[PDB]
Structure 1
């Protein structure tokens, strides 16, 4: 038969399942809703582990339970009372014999030790992957250190000592590859001559590689704490979502730089060379699976100042129009082809973050925090699982690093790019549009001629890599 449980009066996690405290979705069960007590029971269940549940719960729980209260509840979960001796044990003891204690030994082996180990696994994951709770609340960390440091008994000893060390390392807190990265490529600008770096003087292959390293690092730095609760849209977004905002602001700045390079090149022939070079950079972005970079280019080519430059695109070779059109088709029909391509490529990649943000926000906004059943309010956990499915997809693409060498000067050039200068957004985007009208006036105004501005060759070196010995 099943093991008997502690009385629910001394141990709250032994209350029977009912529709008043837990609801399952229609081979482990999937929870639709439940009380916080039932969620924690199933998070640390004696019959099975649910590693995806641990991640989901620790990513999303603050929408229904405070960190201090979570710690109190898992300590309460951990402290399981042992059963009293059975009648057979009693009779042995009355005869001066050692009891078999069969039921006690089974309850230790099959209930207490799995539940306690799974509580410790929650603590381990909490500290390793969600340490910001402790960075932001020193007293929470003290309570966790005291709890872990006072767990007695040899069955848990290896993990108690390990978690203690992990905590101490987190308080005061290297890649290997299948091959060598390719050789850094140079064009007109030579190594160390940062003063000449520009769109046409750096090698287009190396522009795409160094921007991909930068954009990959920015993508990989975004933590789930910046996303849950839609906090990047709220008044404290600069405090709560700084890595996400830095990543988006890089993307915006690069798009505007592409636009500025185009419309400030007033000579038609030179502007064709600029647009052609940006499409070559797009081609290398595609080859590197840097979808953020792909859409930085697509956004620039579809901006109001650039999209209207019919005389410029008239001279772009058909094969380059095909590259740009295929990249733009990724975004059509609510990113249908982008989503399919992202799910088919071989990482590393740099996803476009914007779709994730819209889906997290709409999942939060479009589902209730609680479900009301039989007079009780149950936490709607299915809503949190949906959010954590998105944060988990983000994390899955954050694992794989690019096998590309950093060039420190090119990296610094793109980190310091500031096309807007001291201008405000409206002033600057009106400036770009007025430049577009200057260089290609609205019909029927005649098309003017403008002098060249570049003193170096406009011919591209192309985007196929070279390899000397």
Structure 2
């Protein structure tokens, strides 16, 4: 038979499942909704582990339970009463013999030890992967340290001592590869000559590599805490989502820089060389699976100032138009081909973050926080699972590092890019559009001629890499 349980009067997590406290989806069960008590019971269930659920729960629980209350509930979960001696044990003791204690031993082995270990696994995951709760609430950290540091008994000792050390390390807080990174490539600008760095003087291969390292680092820095609760859209977004916003602002600045490079090149022949060079950079982004970079270029080419430059695109080689067209097709039909491509490539990659943001926001806006059943309000956990499916996908692409060497000066050049200067956004984007109208006027105004601005060769070195010994 099943093990008997403590009375639900002394231990709340022994209440029977019912539709008034838990609802399952239609081989472990998947929870649609439940009370917080039932969610914590299943988070730490004696019959099976559920590591996905642990991640889902710890990522999303703050929408229905405060951190201080979660800690109280898992401590309550941990403190399981042991059953009293059975009739057979009583009779043995009355005869001066040692009881077999079969039911007690089974309950320790099959209920207490698994539940307690799974409570500790929640604590371990909480500290290792969601430590921001403790950074933001020092008293919560004190309570966790005290709880872990006062767990007695030898069955849990190895993990209690380990978790104590992990906490202490987190309070005061290296890559190896299958090959060597390729040699850094140089074009007109030579190493150390940062004052000459520009779109056409750096090597297009190395522009794409260093932007990919930068954009990969920005992608990898975004934590789920910046996403759950749609906090990057709310009034405190600069406080709650700073790494996400830094990432988006880099993408916006690079797109605007591409546009500025194009429309401030007034000579038609020179501007063709600029657009051609940016499409070459896009080709290397594609080779590197840097989809953020691909869409940075596509967004620039389809901006109002650039899209209308028919005389420029007329002179772009057909093969390059085809590259740009196939990159643009990734975004068509609600990113259908992008999504399929992302799911097919071999990482490392840099995903485009915007689709994740829209899907998290719409999942949170389009589903209710609670389900009402039998007069009770149950936490709608299916909604939180959907959000954590998205944050899990984000995290899966944050693991793989690029095997590319940083060039500190090129990195600094792109970190410090500031195409808008001190101008406000409307002022600047109107400037870009007025430049577009200047360099290629609306029909029937004639096309003017403009002097060259570049004193160095415009011929691209191409985007196939070189390899000296």
Shift of residue 437, structure 1, vs aligned partner = 0.1
> Can you list the C-alpha shifts for 1:78-132, whole angstroms capped at 9, x where unaligned?
0000000000000000000000000000000000000000000000000000000
Shift of residue 244, structure 1, vs aligned partner = 0.0
Supply the distance in 2 between the matched residues of 1:173 and 1:461 (Cα, whole angstroms).
44
Supply the distance in 1 between the matched residues of 2:398 and 2:328 (Cα, whole angstroms).
24
Supply the distance in 1 between the matched residues of 2:435 and 2:24 (Cα, whole angstroms).
60
> Can you list the C-alpha shifts for 1:6-33, whole angstroms capped at 9, x where unaligned?
0000000000000000000000000000
Shift of residue 222, structure 1, vs aligned partner = 0.1
Secondary structure of 2:295's aligned partner: helix
> Can you list the C-alpha shifts for 1:333-379, whole angstroms capped at 9, x where unaligned?
00000000000000000000000000000000000000000000000
Secondary structure of 2:26's aligned partner: coil
Length-normalised TM-score, structure 1: 1.00
Shift of residue 384, structure 1, vs aligned partner = 0.0
Supply the distance in 2 between the matched residues of 1:29 and 1:138 (Cα, whole angstroms).
36
Supply the distance in 1 between the matched residues of 2:100 and 2:348 (Cα, whole angstroms).
58
Shift of residue 199, structure 1, vs aligned partner = 0.0
Supply the distance in 2 between the matched residues of 1:58 and 1:226 (Cα, whole angstroms).
14
Shift of residue 389, structure 1, vs aligned partner = 0.1
> Can you list the C-alpha shifts for 1:396-422, whole angstroms capped at 9, x where unaligned?
000000000000000000000000000
Shift of residue 253, structure 1, vs aligned partner = 0.0
Secondary structure of 1:33's aligned partner: strand
Q: Which residue number in structure 2 is paired with residue 271 of structure 1?
A: 271
Shift of residue 321, structure 1, vs aligned partner = 0.2
Secondary structure of 2:7's aligned partner: coil
Shift of residue 309, structure 1, vs aligned partner = 0.1
Q: Which residue number in structure 2 is paired with residue 411 of structure 1?
A: 411
Q: Aligned runs of 1:45-124 on 2, under 5 Å?
A: 45-124=45-124
Secondary structure of 1:379's aligned partner: strand
RMSD: 0.1
Secondary structure of 1:103's aligned partner: helix
Shift of residue 249, structure 1, vs aligned partner = 0.0
Supply the distance in 1 between the matched residues of 2:37 and 2:463 (Cα, whole angstroms).
59
Supply the distance in 1 between the matched residues of 2:179 and 2:323 (Cα, whole angstroms).
29
Shift of residue 167, structure 1, vs aligned partner = 0.1
Supply the distance in 2 between the matched residues of 1:427 and 1:178 (Cα, whole angstroms).
49
Shift of residue 153, structure 1, vs aligned partner = 0.1
Length-normalised TM-score, structure 2: 1.00
> Can you list the C-alpha shifts for 1:188-243, whole angstroms capped at 9, x where unaligned?
00000000000000000000000000000000000000000000000000000000
Shift of residue 270, structure 1, vs aligned partner = 0.0
> Can you list the C-alpha shifts for 1:126-150, whole angstroms capped at 9, x where unaligned?
0000000000000000000000000
Q: Which residue number in structure 1 is paired with residue 40 of structure 2?
A: 40
Supply the distance in 2 between the matched residues of 1:222 and 1:16 (Cα, whole angstroms).
40
Supply the distance in 2 between the matched residues of 1:172 and 1:258 (Cα, whole angstroms).
41
Supply the distance in 2 between the matched residues of 1:420 and 1:158 (Cα, whole angstroms).
56
Supply the distance in 1 between the matched residues of 2:317 and 2:212 (Cα, whole angstroms).
26
Q: Which residue number in structure 2 is paired with residue 288 of structure 1?
A: 288
Secondary structure of 2:33's aligned partner: strand
> Can you list the C-alpha shifts for 1:277-300, whole angstroms capped at 9, x where unaligned?
000000000000000000000000
Shift of residue 186, structure 1, vs aligned partner = 0.0
Q: Which residue number in structure 1 is paired with residue 300 of structure 2?
A: 300
> Can you list the C-alpha shifts for 1:143-195, whole angstroms capped at 9, x where unaligned?
00000000000000000000000000000000000000000000000000000
Secondary structure of 1:371's aligned partner: strand
Shift of residue 387, structure 1, vs aligned partner = 0.1
Segments of structure 2 that go 5 or more residues without pairing to the other structure are: none
Secondary structure of 2:23's aligned partner: strand
Supply the distance in 1 between the matched residues of 2:364 and 2:341 (Cα, whole angstroms).
26
Supply the distance in 2 between the matched residues of 1:146 and 1:459 (Cα, whole angstroms).
67
Question: How many residues of Structure 1 are paired with residues of Structure 2 in the alignment?
Answer: 469
Secondary structure of 1:430's aligned partner: helix
Secondary structure of 1:160's aligned partner: helix
